[PDB]
């Protein structure tokens, strides 16, 4: 119980926190990834001066501070705001004391070795955690789905990514990364909503796109002859009530903000699409290896979740693949937090004990022990 | 520690740290308060006898006249440390030893009510029969705070005294722990010594019919209610009161009962709340000089004036039964504040006062894994208390190097804590922050903590941000007092400082049948002018914008008391939490000791010079050394001697 | 008490001075804001020649003096005739001594700092106040009404505002002004009253317009079809009996002088009306702020105390707000005084004390200090 109840899991993402301890679900914990920073002198009412915001706080009084956002697309790119992010974390969020419990963190896929020491350097040096351990994310997501060979399709906020794994070990050189996310689709369906002649225009409007984009956003399969039906004009369209009455209708777009995923060409990208892409990872792998890999192609992250991506994906590489191959897209349901749930299953594991890195092992062999 | 506990063991209660008189509860009894010592303490230097309370209030008494000054006397303990029992104590002392109201001294009703010296005395058992109860710790302990001025003369005679009191546990009235009980009055009167009492205010003898005063205990082994019963009430006469008022009194005291009767139910497909009855109200009214109708519909249908008039507001069950509460305490209050007026009214003579000597008591820091507002209050006061003694030594120290010729060189002792003080005190300070937000018809007790923070975090050294685990319930906010960190809880704050009351029903009360309880209300009559409309500041009016904005207040006119004064220092210790004679928890003592000011006395010494001692006491202890030489020194000189 | 007593609140306006004690629940003065020259010299029997009057005996002696108004549309324009209606307040008005009480004082919304520096450099240079500050007004009439957040239409004498308030920070750039006032409004009732076939002619006669318009006046709903039920004639006339029993009666003209703020068009103004400046304050702000101003629009001023005006307002606003919208018209009974009440909330008030601008700050800082 020691650290069987005891052990955190950490997932940082770029608009994302997901935290909880190991063991539970679902994440304890989500909320946005900024530090919001005043940009002038004064109180709120029963409060003292603030001189930092973090998550919620700093999204709902955005228009007095200056935002920012320490993970650029998945990578740490600021540790001051960083370390805010983990101590709001730790202390009011789940409201635990650090240095009584083991702490597990995730990192980016090809994240910089001197990144993971620089982490540990904070987690040891600054919160001074029992231990901790550092899982990639594409890794924890398939292993959510029990497996341990198969290639990620990852993608939340700012990053997408490939990652082939196997036997647990990610490859390295197969990895591919499209820094175009669910981030870049709110604001492209922003632009084709306002084009299909709209405004929004207050932040109480801005925000709102996003959930429409959530709620009502489809990957169709076969986006051809879905402009086709759009057309003929069936009920395929839906209006969304927004904070007041003003009754905003989203018919055909719906699904054109998901096409900007399988053609980038939308927004004005010149890379390959998610398909093609997941397709690339693999014929860049060894070739005892591609039937595995195309039989487990594992979904998870925000920007996955839209219906019938699975479908499209499934098609999409079956009409790449050589015929005598079995295509199968896994997309669990819970796949916004897969990489979370995978840091649970694995931390609270009876055989995880022994890779967890000490204050021992860190006092001890310098940042480099965790670093492997 | 260790001296403390062996010469209690030995059975001796008091011995010196300084120049406090550590006292400690014997837990049996002792001829120490003997007739006989009285005198023998008459006129003597604390080094000519031992270690006891005498010596400091006869000193005090000396010095008055003396040196032509004030005095004081500072009690301090924890609940159970029994000050109210020495506090009484000295105060017979000055009584007895400069008394001489040369008619009022024969054996013919001899302290009955027509003298003060015995008004005097006759206060005390008033006072706690509505501001005392059994506490988990003592039997009779003091839920309130209190300072008297006994104006000594010119002569050096008895000629005035004056009562003061704060911070009353208002919550006895209305709720009390499960071993504890709520003020005795209730259970005096319910004794059924006078039985009268019983039908005159409509009640019974079973306290169980009283939500109210049932919730803890009823009886308690080592008082006789009945015995009190009189002398409370004849304590009440001999003060002075008409019987009028020692009935305004009795009756209401009982409508407070009543009020924790009063039902209420939800009206049907409404929300609001109605009447479930008038049973009880008819007697809550009657005994208030109120009409029972006016009353229900009042609490009911509170009728508000929000903008520049006067808008009819409805209620729910739950605020009713909170805001008869509410009555319910605030009326208990400012009875007690009454009284107390009335006392010293009596107290009030006409010769003429030179000096006088208070007698202040109060408790002493108190940490809990729960400090809420109460506690704030109380340890900010105590704080000041003691930088005013820090001071006090820092000054007396610094003669002493003057009077030798010693070259010490040294900052007030004080100082240490202005930082603690301003942060509290200040007008960026907790309090402030906490009564603007007062001011602000939509805020909340989150809205204050975040002001309070903004402010204060990161740029107060004294302020920080809670541990919330350990022993502690909850996070808010700790400081840094001198005896230690501070784990402070915000939540009710906003309103306890507000000090929320129906004004409807107050509108009753201000134009009663019963003069007093008129009365008592008046000076909230008198402030609504300046609230007139919806928002704004009570105190255009007279009417209190704080919770706090008079404690501070109070608390001012007090250490201002205390300084045109001598200080002199008397700290109660309490041996054990099992009452037992002879015995001693170390770790409870030791607390005491800190919070006391104890061990910063003996620190502050040592720094140093650790050991001082004062002359006669050191005469007589080491004469014997040089005996011929060291003898004919202290007695020519009482310090050229020890020279 | 040193200043809890002490503190003074004096709101300056356009028609009417509003002063008294923090604490107290209403102003304990209320007087014109002129100050009268006397055109002849001469004296009153038993006083002495007097160089000027201010307040009401300005106003009962008119015909002898020259009246000014030192506050023209809520910002001071002439600053000798205002350190006489001061002087007079303190001295003559409250009697107090100013050299040992705290004073708040109120200022107008848009008002030019250099102003709120000179009433400083007056209020300590030549009154010797221990401490003070300057409110803005619609910020103490909200606060007064508990909150914090909402949208205050004020109006009184000589100027109609709509400020835009969000945790206490007024929003200046979302402020309206329009000059149609009390004033205004006591001049248009004069002319649909001589033009209903009458004549005040003499100087009791003109004044008691005013006492027609307070009394008898009010703002209907469906102002359309209650001109149309005047001309069924329904016994909704008002006759009311003059200094002298010449009973005047009105009957309909009673409402034509409130829809005046809705219609400014009455009145050859060509500006927008209260309910559509509102709306336009509102439509200024940010997005996601405007549900909260929605539903708070708190009035204040003598002019918004016509019955049936937050009926009108409430039915204005929600017809022209989106239906997902709640609307909410707060007008309370003491609005006539919600300016004063908030600031003698406000300077009563336990936190207040570490705001108020101290010879200390003055001697040292310059007018600068208070001017924020």
Redesign the interface.
Known sequence: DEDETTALVCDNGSGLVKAGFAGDDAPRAVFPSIVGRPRHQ??????????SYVGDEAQSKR?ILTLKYPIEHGIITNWDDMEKIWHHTFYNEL?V?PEEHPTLLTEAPLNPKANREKMTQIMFETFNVPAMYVAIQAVLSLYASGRTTGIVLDSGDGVTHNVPIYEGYALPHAIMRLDLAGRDLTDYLMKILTERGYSF???????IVRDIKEKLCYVALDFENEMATAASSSSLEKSY??????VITIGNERFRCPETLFQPSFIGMESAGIHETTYNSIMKCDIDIRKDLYANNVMSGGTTMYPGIADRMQKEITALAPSTMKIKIIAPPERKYSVWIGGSILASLSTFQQMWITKQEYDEAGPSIVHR | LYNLKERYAAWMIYTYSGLFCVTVNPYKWLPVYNPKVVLAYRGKKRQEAPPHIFSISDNAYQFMLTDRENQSILITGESGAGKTVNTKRVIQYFATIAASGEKKKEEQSGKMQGTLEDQIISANPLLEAFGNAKTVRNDNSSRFGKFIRIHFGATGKLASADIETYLLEKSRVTFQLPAERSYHIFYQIMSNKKPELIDMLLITTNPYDYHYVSEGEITVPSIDDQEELMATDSAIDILGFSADEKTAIYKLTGAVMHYGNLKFKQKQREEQAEPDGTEVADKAAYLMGLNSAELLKALCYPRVGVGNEAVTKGETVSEVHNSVGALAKAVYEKMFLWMVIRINQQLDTKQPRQYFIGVLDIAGFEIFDFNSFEQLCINFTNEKLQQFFNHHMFVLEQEEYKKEGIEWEFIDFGMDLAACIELIEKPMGIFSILEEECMFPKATDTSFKNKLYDEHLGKSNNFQKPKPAKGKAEAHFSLVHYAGTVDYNISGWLEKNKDPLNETVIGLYQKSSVKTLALLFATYGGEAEGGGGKKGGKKKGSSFQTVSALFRENLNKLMANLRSTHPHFVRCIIPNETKTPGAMEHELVLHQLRCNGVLEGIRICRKGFPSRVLYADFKQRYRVLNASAIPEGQFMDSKKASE
């Open positions: 004064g109180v709120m009412v029963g409060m003292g001066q603030k001189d228009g409201r004391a225009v207050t932040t109480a409007e801005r925000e009530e927004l904070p007041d009455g003003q």
